[PDB]
């Protein structure tokens, strides 16, 4: 924990003295693509929640029970979580007092104090644990309990923004494999038309989000008075035993509304990768939306040869189909920059002996060159300063 926290304050120190890793036009073009996407979708922005909101207690009680669920054992701690449950039961006894106290924190307070970090020792896995003071926890719990239902009411999210509210084996086979088998002429194998999937993770997507560009992006959909609140809560002094270091560039994810930030950043990364035309084909017009992988006017389905897409939280899955000349052009475009052939004893199933060899991927040269070529083709149109693959 000492090593990771000192490396974190070293990289937060090196972000300031070196300037932004993102270029100016690199962010201006993302902002232009997002404002074109929002004027195409006609998503009217989220207003500020009034004190006379209609379904106002119905979200605050959800947030308080969401906080109360994590307290079932009573071998608890000395001060912090007992006054957490004390503030929760004071919000129970007076809903309107905490309801306006959230608004008092929500208009004018943008400088917040220590939250604590621990690590989970999950044995070649470690997740940080950010415990936040409860006086901010009730506020940002009501904040994301408002913002999720407010964003999905006017359908901010396209249907590939996942996990959504159905079940994940529907995301895995019964809308996904049922999505890919129902496509027009799935396998043809006589004209060189082949199916090929990519699975990647947006590596360091969480840390490589500049809060200035983030604040300028999510003030388009959300009112600025709480957009500045959300992008001012994302830096505190991270507390430990002896290391009280502050934050400047990487966002902390132990807060409530950080998941909305992660999924909106994933959506803008999707419209950077998938573009603006193919995503408009997939999610359809605003007057008639689509399902998870259902398309309209199936002649449009045959064009723009990447077939279908899904984005789990930091993991994207692409099914895409090529004909002969398009895949040939893509491979011969990849091979202009990369000499020294038969360097493909790494790709796919070389160490993963989970299937037999007739079930595993055979390393034929054209298929592995197509796989590495489309890995390069998704490796660009995604600059290193925002994410990496």
């Amino acid at each position: 924990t000492r090593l990771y926290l000192k490396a974190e304050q070293e990289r937060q120190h090196n972000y300031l003295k070196d300037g932004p890793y993102i270029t100016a036009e690199e962010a201006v073009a993302v902002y232009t693509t997002t404002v074109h996407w929002l004027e195409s979708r006609r998503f009217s922005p989220i207003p500020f929640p009034p004190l006379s909101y209609k379904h106002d207690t119905k979200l605050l009680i959800l947030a308080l029970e969401r906080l109360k669920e994590a307290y079932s054992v009573k071998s608890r701690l000395n001060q912090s979580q007992r006054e957490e449950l004390g503030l929760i039961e004071q919000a129970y006894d007076n809903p309107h007092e905490a309801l306006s106290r959230i608004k008092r924190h929500l208009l004018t307070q943008r400088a917040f104090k220590e939250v604590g970090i621990e690590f989970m020792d999950l044995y070649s896995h470690l997740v940080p644990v950010y415990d936040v003071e409860p006086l901010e926890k009730i506020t940002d719990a009501y904040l994301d309990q408002y913002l999720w239902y407010e964003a999905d009411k006017r359908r901010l999210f396209p249907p590939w923004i996942k996990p959504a509210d159905t079940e994940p084996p529907p995301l895995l086979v019964y809308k996904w494999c049922q999505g890919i088998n129902n496509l027009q002429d799935v396998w043809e194998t006589s004209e060189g038309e082949c199916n090929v999937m990519l699975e990647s993770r947006f590596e360091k997507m969480y840390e490589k989000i500049d809060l200035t560009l983030l604040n300028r992006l999510l003030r388009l959909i959300v009112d600025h008075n709480i957009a500045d609140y959300m992008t001012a809560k994302n830096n505190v002094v991270i507390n430990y035993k002896d290391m009280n270091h502050t934050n400047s560039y990487g966002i902390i994810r132990g807060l409530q509304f950080a998941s909305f930030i992660v999924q909106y950043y994933g959506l803008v990364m999707d419209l950077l990768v998938l573009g603006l035309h193919r995503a408009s084909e997939m999610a359809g017009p605003p007057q008639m939306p689509n399902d998870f992988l259902s398309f309209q006017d199936i002649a449009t389905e045959a064009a723009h040869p990447i077939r279908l897409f899904c984005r789990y939280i930091d993991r994207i899955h692409i099914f895409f189909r090529f004909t002969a000349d398009e895949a040939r052009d893509l491979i011969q475009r990849y091979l202009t920059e990369h000499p020294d052939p038969n360097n493909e004893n790494i790709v796919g199933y070389n160490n993963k002996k989970c299937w037999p060899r007739d079930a595993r991927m055979r390393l034929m040269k054209h298929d592995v060159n197509l796989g590495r070529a489309v890995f390069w083709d998704i490796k660009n149109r995604l600059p290193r300063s925002v994410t990496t693959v």
Partner: protein
């Protein structure tokens, strides 16, 4: 709540003067209401003697007016940069100079 009256503040000053700097449970063991974290928050917020809680100047204000435009949020990032270091006096200066520029 944390009202933080002066009778506890001067006791916390004497406790920081006697014991040390990273020594917080031993000095929060004598206040009957406060924990270590809130005492840390006020001592790095109000009771440190390097805090310039008054005497607003001209150079630091013109420094922060094109520093709060580089980043609209992140007042605690620019708090060691200015030297005001209280991280809430910068917010008061920002809203006060924006009230004076509107009136």
């Amino acid at each position: 709540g944390g009202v933080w009256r002066n009778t506890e503040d001067e006791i916390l000053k004497a406790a920081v003067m006697k014991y040390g700097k990273n020594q917080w449970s031993r000095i929060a063991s004598l206040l009957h209401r406060k924990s270590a974290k809130q005492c840390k928050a006020r001592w790095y917020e109000w009771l440190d003697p390097s805090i310039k809680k008054t005497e607003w100047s001209r150079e630091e204000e013109e420094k922060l007016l094109h520093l709060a435009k580089l980043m609209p949020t992140q007042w605690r990032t620019i708090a060691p940069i200015i030297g005001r270091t209280a991280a809430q006096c910068l917010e008061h200066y920002e809203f006060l100079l924006d009230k004076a520029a509107q009136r």
